[model samples]
Target: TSVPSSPLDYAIFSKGALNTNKNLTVENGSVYSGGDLTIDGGAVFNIDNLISKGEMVINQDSDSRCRDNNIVVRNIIYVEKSLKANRISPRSTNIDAKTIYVGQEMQLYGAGSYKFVQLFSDSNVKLAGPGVNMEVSTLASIRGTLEVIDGATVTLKSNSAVYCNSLVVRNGSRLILENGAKLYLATTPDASTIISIQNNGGTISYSSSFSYPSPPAEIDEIRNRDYTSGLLTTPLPADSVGSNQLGSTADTSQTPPQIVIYGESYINDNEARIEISARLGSPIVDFSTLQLHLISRGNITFVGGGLTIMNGSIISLGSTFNINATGNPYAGLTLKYQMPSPPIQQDIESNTGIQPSQ
Candidate 1:
């Protein structure tokens, strides 16, 4: 009644592609970029979310800000492509996002203030800034077109909601909507798809229904799982298990009732697997494997650890786990292994060990 946790909370989960070039600090945890999330240099993020499959270039000219309160973005950012925000400088940089999904085309030359609770784009959304302070509560650009030029400032906060079909504000850009905000264009302003809304002062008002904002179910649950399969795979399945006998007795009718602990001995069995035998000599695996706290559907064969130990966050449903040493090759005694990235749906074939000589 305790093993039900791993949803693969990422700290930096990558399929390939995350180039930060230098100053990078990430706290809390949550960042998944299967490919392309290049912020040339300087970043201090206190994250809990961000998913980019590709093309998310935040061209950094670097002043290295987001200090004191230090870059707090607690939830959501799903970009599959084209989410370019260049030089987010000055104005003291503050971004508190709740939801933002751009699958293509979304460009913003920043200065500061971007308080979005929901802002989505399928394509075409350009906001050229002078000081850019887009404070939305709900804004969507389903199939393209929603641009605000040079002195950008868009706010739709009070009862906010906007599902743009198309709208562009000229150079002195400022689209403010707050009379119980409502701009659900394209069905109500469908004069063949809005022929006018391109204002110089911006005061758009429309309705006819709107609702579109769906990505963030952990971004396809981390893009279809299987990150090199369970416990970091590659020919290490304990040389084909079963050197056996960690348990074999009390099943207590199995219902959160199966145990096997040995420093001395404690047994109640439904034994999945755990092979640790340097003749059970003291040091029962330390360095924080938490005294080997284990959970199993089945399969876990490890061998002798006197001090160096690290094991946690393992969701090997397709089961394949093993780590070994102590077949006696002791010349300096070094075998290091750490496990944290676990997102597997299948294929994780082996993990056998014996690496001494450092």
Candidate 2:
């Protein structure tokens, strides 16, 4: 296809694969790919309001940046240069892309059957869209960073399903999971703690949510046998976990399975509440390095069967998971707020609440 090199205001691929040697500029709703598009290195896509319903194979090296504007897609995408890709419609989106980075805003929602974002990665992926939620159907094994902040909402069909090398959740972002989605998401340093709420965790209350299983009812699954990883903490705190929470691996004796949340996490305000599934049972390594965190004025709530911990779990406050580990009837964690702001920056150690571990 001998296209123009002189800034053609329109670009579209109807079908098949097309290898481009030069960068393309897409604006004016004229850019549309009916099939697959392969963009080579340094091949930038200076796009604005890009719309498509096909596979966007962004060749390695070319950070396909776009113009600051609105965009749309039904199957897949990845970009930021002021771009917006909203999945036209799907209770299920076939996100078969190799990698995806959302430095801008993206919207995807479905409700009929199993609406999912199936990210099939070759290497690491970039899932850092503040306060964003993505659903997956099958199990996943991935690397890279997964962040949800700015009071965004995200839902994975499976808990320990999408493993990331570095995980961060703050600025009042909430995460949720379908009752009976996959059992595990292979993410994190240990491929266990799918969602690791870090030191910058928040509250003013952007809480989390976790539901029960499907037809087979998780109640029928307590199901596995590896008993090492904990959902909340020992002596069985107030949270109770679920009925038949099973391991992701078919073989339980290999390694105890469990999901975990670490660091000075927060939960503040937001229209949507964060949700952590009660069925999450994958092991995590040092979950007690800081104090417990919670909120009183804003809105972060645990809606599953409560929570239980077993791994390296500890509560200095010795009262509840929401208190601090320092003072009387205390334990630990931070705060964001009801509205989004330049997330109040914070850095520290033992506070007035939690005492120094001497």
Candidate 3:
């Protein structure tokens, strides 16, 4: 029941803004940006939490430059400011946050898959998906309106709760919540607001005496705590820094080579391409089970796809991995034979014994 109590547990902790244009694959770590957080590509699995001090924008839509990227988050997403999400694939970028808290407005445009346990926002919450069924677990907006439009079907799951000021469901849109779900409306439920709920397909109970729930205990600590102290500055291992013509070929390589980088591994192919030409054997390094963590403070520029690490899990600390080669788009810096598995998911509610309303 021990949750992530400190920011040091995060894989990519940027003191300032964090932006990624290429792929970012994190196995078992959280992502923290002291400033804005932008995830253009990559996929995150089994991550604990993603917190941004400023605004957060996650764009993966039809018109976005970086399309076809499957980015998913496992646990909580806490933003100090606004949160904007464009469209993604039908089930892509599913942020299954046990709790999602936004300091400002929350705008979700286009079609995508998203799930959350408790959602709290300080400003307006708008959903403009044209025809997608958006399943939101529970939501609470402190001081703004809630709008659902363009045939978007928004559902709050069973035993959930909703707190909003005004509501709007238009253009054949549906807002449904079921099975003992509570809806707390600050404004009186009139024809404009109650009509949508009365007609929409769901079972919801309106209450005038329901009290607003306080945010999780860690909310204030995370927002005000200074996370820059005692950050890990472990230097990268010298053995894995420069041009690399290492590894054994496919047939004979028995033991998986190990390169444990302690600090930063800056690989800029501009001077010498970091290449591991010898293919690792199937038994030694299975592409499917490959996990690499190049947790470094260096930028990797693969000039013409000079293959870096084959079939490895990569975790770039604060650097960007730029892949320019066309034929083989390989981007990874692997070592340590097997990277440490991500931290196990923990229950935040256990800290204060304050369970979310079911």
Candidate 4:
């Protein structure tokens, strides 16, 4: 047990089996463990404060920080990254880890109550940053491999919500949106068929998901997106960017651009590059199983609401896939008629739907 001044205010390791082969630090106050907390040979576990009843294992070779504490781990917690922290509160936690790395120059600015620390995992969340500006909010599940690499600057602080399974912006990375930040993927059948940009210079920015924040910057806040299949369901599945594919949709009677995933979405295109945007409201698809990925660029659209991909959803588009929807409006890309059930939720005095008049 060696926590030699990394950040220790007080410490308590409840005997029985407490082995730290390398580095472990906890600061702030009162770190009481009931038993069994192991960080074997590849150590670097630095959290602000913790209280465990039993079982918390972090197998590290590098980077690990679940900062700003109140993690009620009765079971598991894990992830990926450039690792750093300042605030932590997973509604107090349930625990599940395979990878949890939201660190690197980390300093998530704070204010008011703040209890948004729920990285109860599936694996991979690397938000490498220059530091500060992350209010923090997440409740992840499964297909986790989200990266905002090296030159990271992820900001999302407007009633934040981030549920991930697939998201990538490599090259140098930057996914910033001051307000209205909602990174989607409510939980799935597993994603990532290229929800990527690989930005050579690195930069992806947007603002206004409606926030009134002044903190350092959301420690990678993806704003209001919830789906690990426990939010009730009725067309509100988001932050799963494996289906932003539109226009020229390509291939057959054009079955080339088809979609159907009851649990995944994140689309916005106009050759706008990165700045991945979602929400004009409307995400509810569960045809059984089918994976489709590619909704390139960004003008960030899906207003008044309309998106459907039925029949066990399965997608494949690679002709150097470059999705286009020129001016922006949901009046194009019409395929597979009358399959959803209640006419696309018909609103605005009803927009009409039958899919036969071609």
TM-score winner: 3
Ranking by lDDT: 3, 1, 4, 2
Candidate 1, backbone clash total: 6
Worst 10 residues of 4 by lDDT: 312-321
- Tens-place lDDT digits, model 2, residues 181-294: 432223323222224332122121122132312212211111121111221232211223332221111112223322222122222211011112232343322222211122
Query: Candidate 3 residues 1-358, lDDT tens each?
Result: 1235443355555656776544445555677777788766434345667888888887663433233434445566889999887675542444567777889988877465666777777788888776445565665545577788776666777766777776777776777777666666666645544556532344444435455666676676677676554444444333333334221112222233422222244543333222222222122213223332333455444444333343232334443332233334324222122333322111111111222222
lDDT of 4: 0.28
**Clashing residue pairs in candidate 3 (N, C-alpha, C atoms within 3 angstroms):** 28-342, 235-263, 236-263, 236-264, 259-336, 291-313, 292-313
Q: Could you arrange the candidates by TM-score from highest to lowest?
A: 3, 1, 2, 4
Candidate 4 stretches with Cα past 4 Å from truth are: 1-19, 22-147, 150-160, 163-168, 172-181, 184-205, 211-358
Give each model's whole-structure lDDT: 0.47, 0.27, 0.53, 0.28
How many clashing pairs in candidate 4? 60
Clashes within 3 Å, all models in order:
6, 75, 7, 60
Task: Tell me the TM-score of each prediction against the true structure.
Answer: 0.29, 0.26, 0.68, 0.20
Which parts of model 3 are misplaced by more than 4 Å?
Answer: 1-8, 41-44, 61-72, 88-93, 138-142, 189-193, 198-209, 231-266, 269-298, 302-358
Question: Candidate 1 — which pairs collide?
Answer: 236-350, 236-351, 236-352, 237-351, 237-352, 250-269
Greater lDDT among 1 and 4 belongs to 1
Better of 1 and 3 by lDDT: 3
